[PDB]
């Protein structure tokens, strides 16, 4: 299948409570593999998946040095953002950044990403050309001008097309037994009366990996989009995910409802119904 690598940085100021906290996590697809937290007793980039543990001390030392340098950069960026938005030094603010690379099923680069936010709103994004910028506001246009003058896009492009792809491919090979294994959902429908004339049908998907899934209810073969309660996909804690979709249906009409499940681990989409007794 297709695969991605993504890093997520969060920098959170806290005036009066020390320097801003910096947390970074790295993922391959829906598998976290590294973390870094500037509030740890001894901040270090640390493994979070079995297949990264084999990397040697040069890897861990180099990733730690880079994350410490990044924490310093993002502390500076929080100070700069206060200037750009005319904000006081008393408030708590957050910079977030996500970046990485996507590969298609053939292992080829599909696209790169590198986007940042300030206080949970888009700030600046590298465009898909890996060459030009989209700034969300007049503050981010200042950053854009600085980055254009310094040819930052070219440096990010070189990472995203080069080391990002090369290291993702390495991880996919070293973690192949898990990263390249889809676990299909285990599915079933439950039934719970709500009253004498309506009942909830809940279609469950459990134990699946990766997280992407489609669960839909049809009534007489028509999708019930506007009448379905669909919970957010949620982690089980064993690498797998869970989801459910529910509809409230007239009693006696349960057999007119079908649940449809699509997942990369399934050879063909599944159709399920409530099976009494």
């Amino acid at each position: 299948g297709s695969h991605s690598m993504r890093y997520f940085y969060t920098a959170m100021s806290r005036p009066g409570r020390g320097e801003p906290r910096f947390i970074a996590v790295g993922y391959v697809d829906d598998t976290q593999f590294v973390r870094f937290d500037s509030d740890a007793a001894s901040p270090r980039t640390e493994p979070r998946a079995p297949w990264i543990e084999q990397e040697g001390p040069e890897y861990w030392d180099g990733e730690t040095r880079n994350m410490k340098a990044s924490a310093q950069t993002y502390r500076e960026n929080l100070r700069i953002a206060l200037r750009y938005y005319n904000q006081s030094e008393a408030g708590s603010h957050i910079i977030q950044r996500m970046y990485g690379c996507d590969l298609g099923p053939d292992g080829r680069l599909l696209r790169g990403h590198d986007q940042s936010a300030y206080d949970g709103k888009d700030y600046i994004a590298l465009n898909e050309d890996l060459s030009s910028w989209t700034a969300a506001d007049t503050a981010a246009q200042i950053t854009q001008r600085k980055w254009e003058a310094a040819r930052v896009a070219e440096q990010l492009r070189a990472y995203l097309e080069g080391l990002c792809v090369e290291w993702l491919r390495r991880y996919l090979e070293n973690g192949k037994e898990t990263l390249q294994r889809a676990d299909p959902p285990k599915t079933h429908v439950t039934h719970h009366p709500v009253s004498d004339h309506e009942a909830t049908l809940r279609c469950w998907a459990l134990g699946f990996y990766p997280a992407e899934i489609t669960l839909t209810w049809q009534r007489d073969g028509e999708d019930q989009t506007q009448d379905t309660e669909l919970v957010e996909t949620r982690p089980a804690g064993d690498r797998t995910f869970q989801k459910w979709a529910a509809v409230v249906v007239p009693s006696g009409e349960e057999q007119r409802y079908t649940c449809h499940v699509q997942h990369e681990g399934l050879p063909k989409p599944l159709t399920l119904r409530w099976e009494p007794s």
Binding site: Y7, I80, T143, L156, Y159
Partner: peptide
């Protein structure tokens, strides 16, 4: 492996 490009705002 993380990117190392320094991106000061």
């Amino acid at each position: 492996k993380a990117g190392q490009v320094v991106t000061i705002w």
